[PDB]
Amino acid sequence: MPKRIVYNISSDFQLKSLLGEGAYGVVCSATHKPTGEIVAIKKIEPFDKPLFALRTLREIKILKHFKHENIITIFNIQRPDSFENFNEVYIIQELMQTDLHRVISTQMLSDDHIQYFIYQTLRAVKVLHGSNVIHRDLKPSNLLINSNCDLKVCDFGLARIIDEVEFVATRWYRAPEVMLTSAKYSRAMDVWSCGCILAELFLRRPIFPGRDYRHQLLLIFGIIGTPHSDNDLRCIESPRAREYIKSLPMYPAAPLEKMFPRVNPKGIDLLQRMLVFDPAKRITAKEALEHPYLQTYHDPNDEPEGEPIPPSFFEFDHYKEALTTKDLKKLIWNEIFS
């Protein structure tokens, strides 16, 4: 473990291995000496820009809220010894052996494995959508996996509750409507991501590896087809976007069965139901669990629907004046000691 990584946590803890390092979070495995339990500890420095604190607060409340086999389990949050000396948040959670990205890049999955992995992903998404929560950042590296093949979603900082400078979700998994029209968060965007994830499981590489906005759209449409009609161009309302779409080559829907010659026809079927342009026609998470491809694991009675979360659960996001770092520090402290 890199000498540069420093965790201001109880000395009963002993860092083991560094599992993830990013500008937002740093994840290390660690042993809690007295119990011998090995856990995962995510460290976040949230007080340099409200933006970081906000993410942190959202990730925390979400984790504490759910108790689902497919959503990573939070054991606790390190308690600072003083408000004055509170500069990092340490989320202690269940240790997993890896993420799906690592699995795709080093393992040949049978069709069984894919069926099961995507099934769990969808199941997690259902409970989220049913509580009116959307992840917004679903991708293979945020799906944790154990050797028995259990899968759990992690990274809830970009989540939002549905209603009537920022961290951006990787574009290879962004739905075309988000990239175009001024998108009011929807359940369909997450399904689009799952769709990219399933495709990646079949392809063993990302299906839409765009280098930028333009290229990204050029790749997506090259697969699902260029939308032409106005009924088709409805969902999009911003003129420049209509115009941009019209200046694109007119691609037909690419024949997937010919793309994935050895992929299960049922898998491709489900795939095509997720990667659809019009978010309103895109299959829902529940529906997807009901699809024939997941028949081996589907069970209408063991697929939690969740319960609605109101918009004020993330109240701190809807203030006239933005909250200060101190206001946010309080809010996080409140979640840690509750």
């Binding site: 086999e69 497919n70 052996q97 890896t98 699995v103 393992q107 049978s110 069984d112 494995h113 099961y116 769990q120 996996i145 050797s147 028995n148 093949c149 259990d150 081996t296 694991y297 069970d299 063991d302």
Partner: peptide, 14 residues
């Protein structure tokens, strides 16, 4: 955990 649903005992050597 959802192991009770892993009807086929799927594994991964990690």
């Amino acid at each position: 955990s959802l192991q009770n649903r892993n009807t086929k005992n799927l594994s991964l050597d990690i």
